[PDB]
Design a protein around this ligand. Structure first.
Ligand code: MG
Ligand code: MG
Ligand code: MG
Ligand code: MG
Ligand code: MG
Ligand code: MG
Ligand code: MG
Lengths: 223, 77, 149
RNA sequence: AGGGGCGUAGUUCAAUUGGUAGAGCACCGGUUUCCAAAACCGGGUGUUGGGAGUUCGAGUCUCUCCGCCCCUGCCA
RNA sequence: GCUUGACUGCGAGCGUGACGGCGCGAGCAGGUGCGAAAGCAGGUCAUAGUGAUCCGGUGGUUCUGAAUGGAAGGGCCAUC
RNA sequence: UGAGCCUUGAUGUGUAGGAUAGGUGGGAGGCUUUGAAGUGUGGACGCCAGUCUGCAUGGAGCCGACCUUGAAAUACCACCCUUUAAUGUUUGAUGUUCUAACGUUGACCCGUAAUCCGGGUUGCGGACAGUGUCUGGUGGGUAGUUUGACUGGGGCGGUCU
RNA sequence: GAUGGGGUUAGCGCAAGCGAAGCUCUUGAUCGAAGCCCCGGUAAACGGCGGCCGUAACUAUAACGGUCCUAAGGUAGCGA
RNA sequence: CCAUAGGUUAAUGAGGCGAACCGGGGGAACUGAAACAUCUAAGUACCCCGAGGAAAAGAAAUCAACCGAGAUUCCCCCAG
């Protein structure tokens, strides 16, 4: 049934037992076996379940190491914030014209940022940006008067996360070619932000399990 | 009467309590059982009225040693 | 309820194997039928003494085995006389009776059954190589010189 | 108190279990026969207790706002 | 229209109760609000809208802490 | 025969549609004589639409990839979620085959001039029954008590701040 | 006795504080029978055997019912 | 089958009585709480067992608190 490619992947990782961060990051570097450069895919299970409405978590985190995942930023803002966004390196800055370009199907951006005054225009794009999860939300810091900082903060390695129905976290710390020590710092910085996001009523271990995997790599548990 | 032949346990009296702590007199009796103990020296079975706690001490002390103390008290077999 | 086995009760093991077991088992079944005895400190040492004493008996018997062995192994060739076969087959055979009388006199005493005459019943006259088995592991060796009477 | 439970057409009770609330009888009509009654249909009857979420979209899942419940439980 | 005085510590002197108690109070201290200010505000036009103590719960507190350091528990304050 | 997890397999139709397209990322890939596509029933299930792959056969093909679609796919993976199936791990629930505890108000012998008792022999039952501690339920069977005051007598009615 | 919360302190810290191990206080996952809930049966078991409306050629009355409560509303016989 | 149970002798000892005091095994209710359940009465009355002129207790796994004390019993304080 299983081919030789798939059987060697599961031969390298024995996920039936837990592993420590030091060993886990070593395994991740040896799992990078693909024609194209892969990106680490986080597989963290939370004991808390989003079936309770108030227990949902939305957050954001800027990573110094970065991820490499495309970061083209479209900005909805007017006035001085439009110049500050351009000076901060935003690829697209506009309001109605850029919204109408999006309605025309020009989707050459990975991140949308909006000023609160621009929420009126971005609200009309809710049918397009909403299902894709690109809609700016204040809880993730993408709706701010400090548009230049949001453009900055993003660019490099700002990552987002939103809890699913099964209470699982599937983020990305960065590319696989990143150094083990840097990757360990990346996940550690992510992890502290999750602890802050945790509510209180949740009478369960915040994290049900922490695992890491690449595009075609196997899941190695982290302790 | 309800007296253990090894430990000497006998009925004692106490109170039945309740959620209102009402006290009514009661009796606590030992977990006595008639058992036939195999004594190797006489190659015989001797029946004793023993409590469940007495059974535990018989293994620890030995069948001969416990009987020796009973003979000091003095009784029939 | 620690108890020292006296036999191979079920799967508990074999003779001489202290094992933890539920009180009832020994308190009323193993002991009153004689299949075991409590392994109490006193009893266990005595049984362990029985273990080492039979080991010493095994030692002593095998020790005295090598004694007899060497006594007769190193040379200790015997000479027997029978009616000359006239340059060839020495007429009659020599059997359990006379190979045992030879050793009796010359020292070590061996049973006719013990005697191991491999090369038939040693009918021809000449040098003959005869072994003895004093003990199951002892492989003794003797040279016999047959001479005419 | 705590753990299970239930509130859908005037009559009750099914369900769906995110995508899609019928039947019951009462009523008015229509069929059916030579005619009546019985039967057979059409049709007029709904916010799934209520409120807010979750959601592309939930009477359905959740939080619950409650009434009415069964089990269970505590010394101002 | 603007606001939180439906303020905190207190309180001269009175009222009404056998008592437990209940009621009224200028003024003082600290911080407020509305007024440009004088000033007014310690809930509501007033008189009903209520329940002692014990026991237990919650928060606060350098008060206590059974040899000593803690702690438990208790006390005080807030409060059920 | 239970209830568990562990792993593995399988399971994911409102619809548009590629349609047996869970959940969420990763993901432009995918992918591979090591059985390319295939071709033959291994298919069993299932919506009977489809799905996974006895294995044999053939030898590089295979496939992210429109449109609608929540929507982009059992093409891509961690591994999980539901439906679960098998598999590994644990307490128990009965049934049975036992005897050795225990039971015998079965038989026989003795103590023994004895329908008691004890001991022995034997049979039957048997890890039950039965008893102790703890515990839920039941319990006028038996107890200890309560069951107000005002009031044109009392009760009834009314009243109690 | 799963898990969680506290107390204590070896130690680390200028000290703020943190806190190993152990002991200890507590939270109570999992297991758990009868009973109760539930499903039936049983009245020579304890017990129960009403109202409402319409309907016979004068009326009346209601068999013939219908309706509600209810579980079901008194038969034979007897009856101031 | 030995044995054991049992049986027959012979030696000793105990039997009962008696006031209170003492130790131990059991152990009320009236009453008080202005009722009455916890509680009180009360381990009292009473019953039973045993002992002595006394009995019982008794030679620190006791207290203290960083100073120390040094078996038990009894009295006065501590102290309502
Ligand atoms: Mg001859
Ligand atoms: Mg006003
Ligand atoms: Mg009384
Ligand atoms: Mg009166
Ligand atoms: Mg008359
Ligand atoms: Mg009284
Ligand atoms: Mg005297």
């Amino acid at each position: 049934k299983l081919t030789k490619r798939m059987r060697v992947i599961r031969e390298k990782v024995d996920a039936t037992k837990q592993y420590d961060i030091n060993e886990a990051i070593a395994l991740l570097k040896e799992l990078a076996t693909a024609k194209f450069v892969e990106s680490v895919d986080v597989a963290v299970n939370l004991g808390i379940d989003a079936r309770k409405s108030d227990q949902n978590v939305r957050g954001a985190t800027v990573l110094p190491h970065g991820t490499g995942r495309s970061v083209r930023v479209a900005v909805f803002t007017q006035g001085a914030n439009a110049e500050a966004a351009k000076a901060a390196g935003a690829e697209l800055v506009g309001m109605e014209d850029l919204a109408d370009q999006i309605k025309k199907g020009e989707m050459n951006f990975d991140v949308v940022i909006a000023s609160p005054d621009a929420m009126r225009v971005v609200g009309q794009l809710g049918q397009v940006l909403g299902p894709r999860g690109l809609m700016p939300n204040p809880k993730v810091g993408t709706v701010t008067p400090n548009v230049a900082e949001a453009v900055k903060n993003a660019k490099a390695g700002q990552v987002r996360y939103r809890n699913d129905k099964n209470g699982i976290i599937h983020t990305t710390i960065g590319k696989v070619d990143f150094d083990a020590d840097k990757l360990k710092e990346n996940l550690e910085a992510l992890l502290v932000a999750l602890k802050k996001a945790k509510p209180t009523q949740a009478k369960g271990v915040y994290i049900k399990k922490v695992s890491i995997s690449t595009t075609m790599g196997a899941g190695v548990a982290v302790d | 009467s309800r007296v253990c032949q090894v430990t000497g346990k006998r009925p004692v009296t106490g109170n039945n309590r309740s959620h209102a702590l009402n006290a009514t007199k009661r009796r606590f009796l030992p977990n006595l059982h008639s058992h036939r103990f195999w004594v190797e020296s006489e190659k015989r079975f001797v029946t004793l009225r023993v409590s469940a706690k007495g059974m535990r001490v018989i293994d620890k002390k030995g069948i001969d040693t416990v009987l020796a103390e009973l003979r000091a008290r003095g009784e029939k077999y | 309820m620690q108890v020292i086995l006296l036999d191979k009760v079920a799967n508990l093991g074999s003779l001489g194997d202290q094992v933890n077991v539920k009180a009832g088992y020994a308190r009323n079944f193993l002991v009153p039928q004689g299949k075991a005895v409590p392994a109490t400190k006193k009893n266990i040492e005595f049984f362990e003494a029985r273990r080492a004493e039979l080991e010493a008996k095994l030692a002593e018997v095998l020790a005295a085995a090598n004694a007899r062995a060497e006594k007769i192994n190193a040379l200790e060739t015997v000479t027997i006389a029978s009616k000359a076969g006239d340059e060839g087959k020495l007429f009659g055979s020599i059997g359990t009776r006379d190979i045992a009388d030879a050793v009796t006199a010359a020292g070590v005493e061996v049973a006719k059954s013990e005697v191991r005459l491999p090369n038939g019943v040693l009918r021809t006259t000449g040098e003959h190589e005869v072994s003895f088995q004093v003990h199951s592991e002892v492989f003794a060796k003797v040279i016999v010189n047959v001479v005419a009477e």
